[PDB]
């Protein structure tokens, strides 16, 4: 599994400088790679699923230690139903290899979640990816993000109808919804956003893949094949984003600063108009505006910190 | 005149986009993507969002306007910001979470098809193809809810874009598979 | 006129630490010298006056180049008309002197300033009074400032008249009252505020004088009758002032950060009001809020500079 | 009681202030200022102001009543700050340039005595005596327009102040001769 030679020379030399803590991968390909070595298209997906144990390998090695990988999309769900109970039973056959590889997880520390709407998979696929997450919980050596039965736009939704839950349950005033709550609600709400995003064969799209999470992540479209990916289109993404690292960090850096700026610009607005309608004075020596200012904020976290404990109180699925 | 010319081209494409949206990562000319944009509308794009992680069109917007009726001389458009992105996502869910508050709309009744009827583009449809100018491997915050099917081209700059290098954008375009997970 | 040996040595260490830039004078005691000397109340007004031409050399020695001295209070009004008199003689005995020496004032740059009411003085102790300010003008080498026919409560309320003139005129909106224009309206307007007050004899009282430009100036009440002020009063004076630099320094500045910020509280409050009836929501990434508030400082300044330009303009008096 | 002592003491003295002010440079002590204020109501002073530069007593306000109804157990009174002084100087103004503006008050019909009626003050005397603790020899923007005339006497801490402390003050001020410019 170790790096060989050359690529051991390039790995130390790019972790000089910048690298990711967390890449994302767009799994693309897998069939029309089939087409090419003329095999059948479940052995294309399972080859593609040779390659993901592999790049782990090599994002293990180069100290990448979360990775996101986009696995079965809904959208995948409209696809023959002999392509899509192949797919379906590789899940079972890989989900369940990786409790008969038990402890070996505990061994490496590898933590393994999986996002997307995953009631919508066969009720052995969903109790199969249970087991294999709650077992590898509480640990931390490193972090493999599964996106089954997943697109953005069902995780953004999800993530604001628990809001709205919140909202419905008086855990949350709606004025307490923000970008960072709507952050800590989606599927990768444990997981830092990606610095890179990864999509294979020639598509220049994302398909419906972390489009919240990925608003700043590096970009970077390769015309391999999946199942050929190579540690050296690896290194090229990770070469891409050092190269874009300096622009993506200030620009990253000042939307965050804009909207500190304008979130503080927004609040003592209404803390005018509270004052306005009370009569009590904009500005005073008592400090009522900034005393009131340090009110609205702390009473604010303090409701979504209580929102946010109860949703992964819920988030509990020992059942499941 | 020329706009036949114009409409010729664009018809003369496999596939044209419907909305089109400009990404500008590099201080940008007026000049240059004023001229960008008329060139959508003559080959026959409808909508046109020009953005700027900066947010400079969009303070700048009426200067840009009078380079682009100036340059219609030569011869539906939206300025956007970060604004138009994340920030207008938490819009809608404050306002679908009041309507749930006000035990009028249930928190299970948003589903992925009523978030985008309350979304700021209920008038328009999702961008079929973006044009990325500038060094940034990134979309800089571009319409995250709404980029989920577009085609993502890249060219190094509107520093002095032609004709040709805009309608060789197009033709990759054209030339896209959009397999939409089947 | 230059220091002895020992005043030469305590100067020299005094100034290694903070000097004051300027320092203000209650010349209190005269009479009651008068009375223990057993001389006419006029000589000791005169023995009064040979001690302010002393100190003044030594402060223009110890680098102290500019000092406010109380001369005569609208109060003062109330004496016996012999007494009153008695001083607007002698007044008119110096400021004539002053012109006798002219081309010195010339060449010591000192520059001589009068503030008060003087339309109550004699008609020729006006024009005395203007000839010799005139004449001085354009100096820089050292100021004095003579407080004739003054009281701080006259000349605050006549500093907010020259406000409301400019108001009545249209150089200036009532908003745009603020305590620093308020400060380039008083007759002092020209000095900064006073680093050190002194009164002399017992009193501890200040008896209307710079009420408004003494709120944190350093404050010394030393028991000496008037026409007996040694050097080392004056020292003493100043050894207190460096005692208390650190405390009134941050005293100072705090105040002046915390109106600042007030300032700012009170100013966007109004543009939070205009946007609020406007409708035009309170933050957003067009920046209006932003971009409203450099207008209204803006147009703020370029009014009050306005307002400041004509009153000098008005402040011309060379007929007086 | 004891009442009838402080009112001989305070009625004893050849002059006793109308108004005191309690000026504190030094955190201060509410259990000690609180009992300065009953001293001056037990002695026949009638009004007490409370000033502190950095504005603590105004905030503190409540919990320095406290203090104060608690020490009246063993038995017309403001806390001012900063905004007391000049900033009120600069309200008055503003509300006088608008008489001006409205054409109903002329600028030359202000002058010293209407000034005074238009200041918060207008429903008080100005100080007599004020009292100064701490290390600091200035008034650090006590009422700027108020201490024309008043009797400023200094006391190196408020921390522990004695009856006999406060008492020796107010017999100084007794014998305080205010010419009044005469
Ligand atoms: C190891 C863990 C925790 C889970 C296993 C994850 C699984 C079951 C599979 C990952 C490998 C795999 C099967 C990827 C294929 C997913 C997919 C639909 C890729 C899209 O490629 P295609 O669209 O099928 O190829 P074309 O683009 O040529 O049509
Ligand atoms: C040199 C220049 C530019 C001007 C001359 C300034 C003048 C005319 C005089 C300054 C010296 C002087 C006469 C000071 C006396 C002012 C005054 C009324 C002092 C108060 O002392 P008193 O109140 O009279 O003494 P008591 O306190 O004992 O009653
Ligand atoms: C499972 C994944 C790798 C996500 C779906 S990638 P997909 O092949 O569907 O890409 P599309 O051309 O948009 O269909
Ligand atoms: C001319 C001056 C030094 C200002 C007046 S000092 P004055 O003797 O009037 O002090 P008061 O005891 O208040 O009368
Ligand atoms: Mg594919
Ligand atoms: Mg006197």
């Known amino acids: 599994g170790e790096l060989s030679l050359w690529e051991r020379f390039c790995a130390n030399i790019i972790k000089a400088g910048p690298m990711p803590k967390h890449i994302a991968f767009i799994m693309d390909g897998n069939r029309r790679y089939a087409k090419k070595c003329q095999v059948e298209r479940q052995e294309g997906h399972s080859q593609g699923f040779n390659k993901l144990a592999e790049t782990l390998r090599w994002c293990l090695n180069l100290g990448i230690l979360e990775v996101t990988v986009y696995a079965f999309s809904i959208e995948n769900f409209k696809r023959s139903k002999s392509e899509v109970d192949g797919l379906m039973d590789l899940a079972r056959q890989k989900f369940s290899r990786l409790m008969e590889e038990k402890e070996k997880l505990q061994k490496h520390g590898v933590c393994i979640r999986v996002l997307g709407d995953l009631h919508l998979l066969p009720l052995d696929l969903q109790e199969l990816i249970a087991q294999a997450v709650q077992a590898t919980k509480n640990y931390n050596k490193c972090f493999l993000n599964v996106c089954f039965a997943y697109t953005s736009r069902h995780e953004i939704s999800n993530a604001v109808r628990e809001m709205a839950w919140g909202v419905e349950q008086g855990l949350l005033d709606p004025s307490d919804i923000s970008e960072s709550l709507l952050d800590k609600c989606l599927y990768t709400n444990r997981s830092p956003h990606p610095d890179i995003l990864i999509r294979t064969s020639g598509e220049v799209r994302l398909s419906d893949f972390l489009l919240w999470q990925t608003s700043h992540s590096c970009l970077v479209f390769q015309p391999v094949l999946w199942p050929e990916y190579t540690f050296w289109n690896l290194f090229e993404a990770i070469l891409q984003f050092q190269m874009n690292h300096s622009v993506l960090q200030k620009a990253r850096d000042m939307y965050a600063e804009e909207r500190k700026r304008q979130q503080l610009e927004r609040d003592q607005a209404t803390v005018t108009e509270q004052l306005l309608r009370e009569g009590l004075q904009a500005s005073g020596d008592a400090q009522l505006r900034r005393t009131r200012l340090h009110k609205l904020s702390a009473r604010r976290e303090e409701r979504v910190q209580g929102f946010l404990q109860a949703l992964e109180l819920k988030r509990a699925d020992w059942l499941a | ?182």
């Open chain 2, 1 to 182: 005149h020329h706009r036949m010319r114009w409409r010729a081209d664009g018809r003369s494409l496999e596939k044209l986009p419907v909305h089109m949206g400009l990404v500008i990562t590099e201080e940008p000319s007026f000049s240059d993507i004023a001229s960008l944009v008329v060139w959508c509308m003559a080959v026959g794009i409808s909508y046109i969002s020009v953005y700027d992680h900066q947010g400079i069109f969009k303070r700048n917007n009426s200067r840009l306007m009078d380079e682009i009726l100036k340059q219609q001389q030569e011869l539906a458009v939206k300025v956007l910001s970060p604004e138009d992105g994340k920030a207008d996502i938490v819009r809608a869910a404050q306002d679908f979470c009041q309507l749930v508050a006000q035990k009028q709309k249930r928190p299970t009744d948003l589903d992925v098809d009523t978030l985008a009827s309350l979304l700021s583009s209920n008038g328009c449809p999702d961008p079929d193809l973006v044009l990325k100018f500038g060094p940034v491997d990134s979309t800089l915050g571009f319409l995250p809810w709404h980029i989920r099917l577009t085609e993502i081209v890249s060219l190094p700059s509107h520093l002095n874009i032609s004709y040709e290098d805009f309608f060789s954008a197009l033709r990759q375009y054209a030339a896209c598979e959009q397999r939409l997970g089947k």
